[PDB]
Design a protein around this nucleic acid. Sequence first.
DNA 1: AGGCGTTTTT
DNA 2: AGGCGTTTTT
DNA 3: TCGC
DNA 4: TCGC
Lengths: 751, 753
Amino acid sequence: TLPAFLPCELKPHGLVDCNWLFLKSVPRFSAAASCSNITRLSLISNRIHHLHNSDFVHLSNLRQLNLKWNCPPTGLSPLHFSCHMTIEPRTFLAMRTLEELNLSYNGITTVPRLPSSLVNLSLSHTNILVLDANSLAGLYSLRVLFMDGNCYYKNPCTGAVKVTPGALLGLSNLTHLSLKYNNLTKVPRQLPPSLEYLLVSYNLIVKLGPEDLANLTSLRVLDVGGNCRRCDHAPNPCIECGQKSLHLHPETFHHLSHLEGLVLKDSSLHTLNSSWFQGLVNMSVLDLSENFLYESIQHTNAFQNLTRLRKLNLSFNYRKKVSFARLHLASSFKNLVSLQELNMNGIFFRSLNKYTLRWLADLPKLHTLHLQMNFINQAQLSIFGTFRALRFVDLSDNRISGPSTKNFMDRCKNFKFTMDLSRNNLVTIKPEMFVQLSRLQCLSLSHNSIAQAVQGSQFLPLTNLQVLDLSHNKLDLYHWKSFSELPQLQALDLSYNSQPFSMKGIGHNFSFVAHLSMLHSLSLAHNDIHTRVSSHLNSNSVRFLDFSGNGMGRMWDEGGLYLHFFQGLSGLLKLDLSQNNLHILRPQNLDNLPKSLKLLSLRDNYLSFFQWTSLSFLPNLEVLDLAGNQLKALTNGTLPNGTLLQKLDVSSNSIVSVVPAFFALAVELKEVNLSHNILKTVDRSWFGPIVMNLTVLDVRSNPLHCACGAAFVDLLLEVQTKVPGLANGVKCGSPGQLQGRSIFAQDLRLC
Amino acid sequence: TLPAFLPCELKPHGLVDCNWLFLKSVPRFSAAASCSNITRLSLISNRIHHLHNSDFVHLSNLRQLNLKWNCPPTGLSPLHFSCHMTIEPRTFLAMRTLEELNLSYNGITTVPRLPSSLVNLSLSHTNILVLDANSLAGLYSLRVLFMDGNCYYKNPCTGAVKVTPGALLGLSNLTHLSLKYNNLTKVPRQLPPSLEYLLVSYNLIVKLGPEDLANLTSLRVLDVGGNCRRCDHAPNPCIECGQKSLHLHPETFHHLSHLEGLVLKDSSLHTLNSSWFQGLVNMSVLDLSENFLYESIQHTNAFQNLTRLRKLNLSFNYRKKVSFARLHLASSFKNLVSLQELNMNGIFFRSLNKYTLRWLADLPKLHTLHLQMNFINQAQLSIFGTFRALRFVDLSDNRISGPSTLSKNFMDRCKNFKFTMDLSRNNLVTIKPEMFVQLSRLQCLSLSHNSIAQAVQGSQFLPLTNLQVLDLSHNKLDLYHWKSFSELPQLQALDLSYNSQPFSMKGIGHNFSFVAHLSMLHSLSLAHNDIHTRVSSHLNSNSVRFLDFSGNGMGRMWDEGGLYLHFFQGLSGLLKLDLSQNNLHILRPQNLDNLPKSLKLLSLRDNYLSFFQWTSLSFLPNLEVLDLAGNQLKALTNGTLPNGTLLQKLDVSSNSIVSVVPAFFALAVELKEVNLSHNILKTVDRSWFGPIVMNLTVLDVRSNPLHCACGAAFVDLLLEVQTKVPGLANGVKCGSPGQLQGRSIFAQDLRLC
DNA sequence: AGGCGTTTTT
DNA sequence: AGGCGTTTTT
DNA sequence: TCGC
DNA sequence: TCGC
Ligand SMILES: *[C@@H]1O[C@H](CO)[C@@H](O[C@@H]2O[C@H](CO)[C@@H](O[C@@H]3O[C@H](CO)[C@@H](O)[C@H](O)[C@@H]3O)[C@H](O)[C@H]2NC(C)=O)[C@H](O)[C@H]1NC(C)=O
Ligand SMILES: *[C@@H]1O[C@H](CO)[C@@H](O[C@@H]2O[C@H](CO)[C@@H](O[C@@H]3O[C@H](CO)[C@@H](O)[C@H](O)[C@@H]3O)[C@H](O)[C@H]2NC(C)=O)[C@H](O)[C@H]1NC(C)=O
Ligand SMILES: *[C@@H]1O[C@H](CO)[C@@H](O[C@@H]2O[C@H](CO)[C@@H](O)[C@H](O)[C@H]2NC(C)=O)[C@H](O)[C@H]1NC(C)=O
Ligand SMILES: *[C@@H]1O[C@H](CO)[C@@H](O[C@@H]2O[C@H](CO)[C@@H](O)[C@H](O)[C@H]2NC(C)=O)[C@H](O)[C@H]1NC(C)=O
Ligand SMILES: *[C@@H]1O[C@H](CO)[C@@H](O[C@@H]2O[C@H](CO)[C@@H](O)[C@H](O)[C@H]2NC(C)=O)[C@H](O)[C@H]1NC(C)=O
Ligand SMILES: *[C@@H]1O[C@H](CO)[C@@H](O[C@@H]2O[C@H](CO)[C@@H](O)[C@H](O)[C@H]2NC(C)=O)[C@H](O)[C@H]1NC(C)=O
Ligand SMILES: *[C@@H]1O[C@H](CO)[C@@H](O[C@@H]2O[C@H](CO)[C@@H](O)[C@H](O)[C@H]2NC(C)=O)[C@H](O)[C@H]1NC(C)=O
Ligand SMILES: *[C@@H]1O[C@H](CO)[C@@H](O[C@@H]2O[C@H](CO)[C@@H](O)[C@H](O)[C@H]2NC(C)=O)[C@H](O)[C@H]1NC(C)=O
Ligand SMILES: *[C@@H]1O[C@H](CO)[C@@H](O[C@@H]2O[C@H](CO)[C@@H](O)[C@H](O)[C@H]2NC(C)=O)[C@H](O)[C@H]1NC(C)=O
Ligand SMILES: *[C@@H]1O[C@H](CO)[C@@H](O[C@@H]2O[C@H](CO)[C@@H](O)[C@H](O)[C@H]2NC(C)=O)[C@H](O)[C@H]1NC(C)=O
Ligand SMILES: *[C@@H]1O[C@H](CO)[C@@H](O[C@@H]2O[C@H](CO)[C@@H](O)[C@H](O)[C@H]2NC(C)=O)[C@H](O)[C@H]1NC(C)=O
Ligand SMILES: *[C@@H]1O[C@H](CO)[C@@H](O)[C@H](O)[C@H]1NC(C)=O
Ligand SMILES: *[C@@H]1O[C@H](CO)[C@@H](O)[C@H](O)[C@H]1NC(C)=O
Ligand SMILES: *[C@@H]1O[C@H](CO)[C@@H](O)[C@H](O)[C@H]1NC(C)=O
């Protein structure tokens, strides 16, 4: 019965998870029959500061071992405690087929001895400051070596990490090397020619030429960015570059015939020399972000031959203290025929018209365009209508205000054509701002300042639009023709348009909902809807209504005025009534919800009583969420006979008891969440036979009484596969010595 | 020791408070030595459905008794349970000096017999449908009678309540009568001439003349509103009036020589007849709201003789489905020389011209003007500069967007001020200094809840040379230029809260260096701004005393190496700092040590702290108040309050505190209030405090799962400090053992054991 | 001695 | 039987 | 981190 | 509960 790898948790393919258990030593698993099947062990963020020769002898088949964060270096310790990890010399040699080891975020100053089998090692965020030819001796199979972050502001050293010339040459299967944030002044010498990925960003390598990348002819990805930073844009401490620019020899990259990815971000480059990219037929991903290329991208020839480039990042190439009236991409962009994604965020230019992006408009595969954070105040959005293959254009966080002079957007991820105009300065919508954008399927105007009694004339051209996010505006819902000019509209988010609904004395009107014939998903959430609105919603199409964060409590206190508010939503399948200040809920109010309802959320209300037989008025209910209410027990009835309920969430209540056979008639029941309540026990007699059909039974954060004979232990073991965090997350509230500890910290059957 | 009016709570001036204890009967107070000094008893919202002759015999000196909500009528019951209250006949006669009784929200159908001494009775929201000459017999001293709400949508009846002719005549000291929401078709006949206040609103009295107010010449206040309602404005079920208008005889009120207050709201009036107000020299308060007087107020002579009118409500006199281009108040308004307050909310007119309120501009005592919810899109704000005594003008909830083209709430600081304007909830996107011409006298201005998206830089507020308070909360201000707000020489309180959107732009930074140039600034809020990255690393000031920084990301800022380590330090003199809801998962000593040494109040409410090193309080030498509520503390440990600490209040409520280390509080000589509520304490120990427990003014231990075992030690402590523990009598409850879960620590006696 | 705590990337 | 719960005014 |  |  006992899970067998206590205090850890056994998981799928040979993985034992011991993360976050505050262990001071490698667990012995004494009362397991065999540790021979254990091939992966995770000990993340425990407190193991001392490792011994005998610690892994019983785990001799491990292939994967994670020891991250056991002994954090000073700068990474939340309280800046120094930690020094000791490792006896033969500690890891007992695992003769170990393939992957993570020692990151540990206070070690030298590499311990490791087995020949090792393939992937991380020494990142440690205090190892020298790698010489003895550091990783004999690791002939090593393919991947991370040692990032051993000398920077969060894990400081006085000088720099040193990688001696030829130190890694003996690692002749090494393909991936990462040595970022180490204060290096040069690319280490005589690196293994087998390298395909070299990352040396955020060091102090202010000069590069071909000699620094000698014999590395197998490189596919090279990241040399952040070595001459522009600190005006840094979000973190930033080391001032000694020069105006990274010095890059013209022929630096010419011998890297296989190169596919190059990162030159944050290099303080004021010009592009096309010879950098010459002879790289497979250059696919280029990052030029956070440089000073604002003029260069309007003039350069450097893109002429980049005919296989797929992704290009030009973001935050802004001029200090300036925005530009206009920006015109250079004609050489016309050659980027393979280009799928371009990032032009944060260059800072005030008008967007046909000349800005002219040379992108005929590229046959440009799908994705980022134009955020540019202080754009005039935009001829019509230009996007003749682009060859646009799927997503993001103009969010600009200053567009009109024509030129649970996240709803997840629904749009594989759409034909989505535009994001959120976080702009729109106060009214004029249909002319949409000329030539008839192909749009999805549009966000969220987080604008739209304060308008919409009435059918705002969105005239958008005859293909299926999704519209208008959340976080100040829309006045009043005229019945609102949104009826959108013939294909299926999802409409009107959440966080609360301000008008808070006007005491001015009413509103939802009769428009009845005229939206394709509308399937509607949010009216967080609108402060509480008084002076229409008394009936009506639809034949709406299937999901989010009414979270309103005042239905107050509405259902107004005599019968709002008694049939949801009733005319024929076919409604899901209704969210969370956070509606409900202090009671009458049977008549549930009986007048649509009979089609499969999901009702009452999360985070103030219900301290619930009449369970009233679930018979929701014949089709499969999911009921009553979490965050004030239920004192599960009582005043039982789940009623015939109920189709599949999930009941009654977490985060004040439940102290459950009545006999409470769950027993709910034949379809699969999930029950009882967590964060005040149960002293868990009883088979609450469920009867249906406990064996449950897929999840969550009983964490209950103050379970762990006295010696305790009965619940046998129940939880019988369904152990179905109770999340059983091994160490289900804890006792009493007696005193066991408060806050696992129900398995004592054995409560052996006594 | 035991409080001895258990389970109730004894309060000052003979009040015993038994509210909300779910009692099914009048408590006996057996344990009390004497119940003779009990003069007031409150039993609100208990479950007493049956009252007996013997219930009140020990409480024979009661002067006030409140029994409301004990037996709710069906319509008012939250679950629509029917309730019938039984009352034995001599029940209230045991209290021969009873002066005030509240029987409201109880299912009674008959008035019980009452003592002669009674002065104030409420029978509201009951099921009494008839008052006849026997209902209130012998109550010669009765001054006040409320019986509102016995026949309306929330407490329905079949017909209407009936007050039979002359039923109340024998109550010849009766001064206040209220009979609202009763479905009356007429004012009851032969009411007592002693009446000074008569309220008959929200019935169906569609017709009134002098005959209906016969012989009531002592009236000071008459409320006849809501008898012919306009249902287009109702927030609740509304009965359609049978007529276009309430029918009001011209001389209805003429004989009410002493009348001071008249309510004609929601009467469907399309005209005013001046004869209504004639002969009423002391008319002070007039409510004409929710009528159809949109034309009438631009033309009528009705205000000519209202020379003592102080308050006038014209609100929501709008035309159905219409807003007006313009509006001119009638010249008769010029005569309202006593007028202090005028409410013109919700008429719906789009321009506010210099002329619109021309006839108000010379009234010598007009202090307060309400112009909300009018769909005003053009406004000549300059006119308010010429008004003779304006103290507050409210233009909130309109559509103003700029200068005219025509020819914890910071504003609470402004309630005594000489001149405040509220422009909140308008459509401003940029501020132009010209919108402020002639408003140089303004001391307070709200622009909150607009859409202002502007890199303020010193030129926005030029005319406002006397402005002390500026509320800019809930906008989209771009804090960047150092000259922001430096044109406001007298600015003392600035609210920049809920301007978060710019701070959420990933890759564009901001700058707070402007704060250093605001030389009078005493109170600043940067709350709920998502301030977390790419901002200036130092705030500086010599004047700022209160900074609200709640709802930001200091957690993330203090995880960026040393970049923000001295963020608050240069606020010299800072006295209060709110760092609640800043996603703090840890605090180092250096973080507290680099707050200004002047600090008296620090809030860390609702963070994620599960450790706190108490010896770090020595680095806050002037601290008097510390709020750590809503964190994840598991105990009070890792130090004790240090010697010399000036701490007065410590709130550690709503944590997960299971233990307190010995003498944790002992050296805090100044300590007065400690909140330990909503934790997981099984006990409360004198040894946590030592002798300073006697100097505490509040020790809050509710919602802890106290172990109520037979000898339990905490009981003696709590009794020793009983006047200092809120809700001791019934609100401090046991978690265990099972028999006592959820019950008062005094439900058993835990010493006799 | 070793605590602290769920730790993106810059 | 009585339960429900903090209940402004409309 | 926002016209010269 | 929001022009003609
Ligand atoms: C990574 O390398 C950089 C650059 O070599 C290191 O920063 C440098 O640290 C030196 C010496 O510690 C600084 O000089 C000092 O300046 C202060 C104040 O101006 C002065 O009081 C001292 O006496 C001394 O002269 C130097 O400015 C600084 N260089 C730069 C460009 O920032 C850095 O410490 C190394 N490690 C890390 C973790 O960054
Ligand atoms: C530029 O990128 C292309 C696209 O990947 C490279 O072409 C590919 O090169 C590899 C060799 O690394 C080919 O795989 C091999 O094919 C041979 C011959 O049939 C086989 O014996 C090997 O087992 C191996 O699978 C791959 O098929 C080939 N693909 C195409 C579409 O040609 C190209 O070589 C790159 N150019 C440079 C200069 O790096
Ligand atoms: C694009 O590639 C072509 C061909 O490699 C480059 O043109 C050659 O440049 C070489 C070296 O400078 C000159 O000696 C020749 O005149 C050119 N060769 C041919 C065959 O024309 C061209 O410069 C590249 N364009 C850019 C902007 O880098
Ligand atoms: C919500 O708006 C609708 C449509 O504008 C209003 O319903 C109509 O009201 C008119 C009179 O104003 C009646 O003649 C129609 O019979 C109504 N139509 C329907 C479908 O009901 C309705 O009054 C508004 N609701 C509220 C509460 O303002
Ligand atoms: C049972 O309910 C608890 C309490 O709501 C759930 O725990 C939350 O999980 C979400 C997502 O994992 C997190 O954002 C929160 O950290 C958790 N909340 C609390 C209060 O701890 C839990 O996941 C539910 N159980 C299952 C199996 O779904
Ligand atoms: C109108 O109100 C005034 C002021 O309240 C009344 O004048 C007072 O009358 C009382 C009688 O109760 C005298 O004691 C005072 O001497 C008067 N006070 C002042 C300041 O003049 C006046 O009687 C009221 N008139 C009517 C007809 O009601
Ligand atoms: C305001 O009061 C004056 C009294 O000064 C009213 O004047 C009287 O009006 C009636 C008919 O309108 C005349 O017959 C009298 O001769 C007038 N008497 C005096 C003494 O002037 C005046 O009508 C009142 N105003 C309003 C609008 O009712
Ligand atoms: C916030 O703004 C201040 C003032 O504009 C910046 O400090 C100035 O920086 C300039 C150069 O850009 C220097 O000449 C001076 O040190 C400062 N000038 C003045 C007038 O005080 C500061 O850089 C900004 N803070 C951040 C983080 O950008
Ligand atoms: C001790 O803290 C508790 C819990 O934070 C306080 O209880 C709150 O009191 C207000 C009073 O208006 C209530 O509206 C809230 O519902 C209470 N919150 C909770 C979670 O119960 C209590 O007031 C504090 N004690 C004192 C004396 O201030
Ligand atoms: C905070 O206080 C706790 C409780 O005293 C400390 O944890 C104890 O520390 C000793 C180490 O000297 C252990 O042997 C105990 O088992 C720990 N007890 C518990 C209940 O955890 C903790 O070290 C203190 N934290 C710091 C940073 O000093
Ligand atoms: C809902 O169930 C609870 C718990 O059993 C009921 O409360 C008990 O009612 C009995 C007799 O009616 C009392 O003697 C107990 O003291 C109550 N127990 C507790 C823990 O409060 C409650 O009456 C039920 N309500 C309804 C409406 O059926
Ligand atoms: C690029 O490198 C060449 C090498 O001759 C140099 O002369 C030239 O100045 C550079 N050209 C550009 C376009 O930046
Ligand atoms: C009040 O009067 C109306 C009209 O006579 C009538 O329809 C209704 O029955 C009465 N009761 C209530 C509770 O409104
Ligand atoms: C007001 O009442 C008088 C009688 O006092 C009547 O003759 C007149 O028509 C009424 N005028 C208005 C404007 O209602």
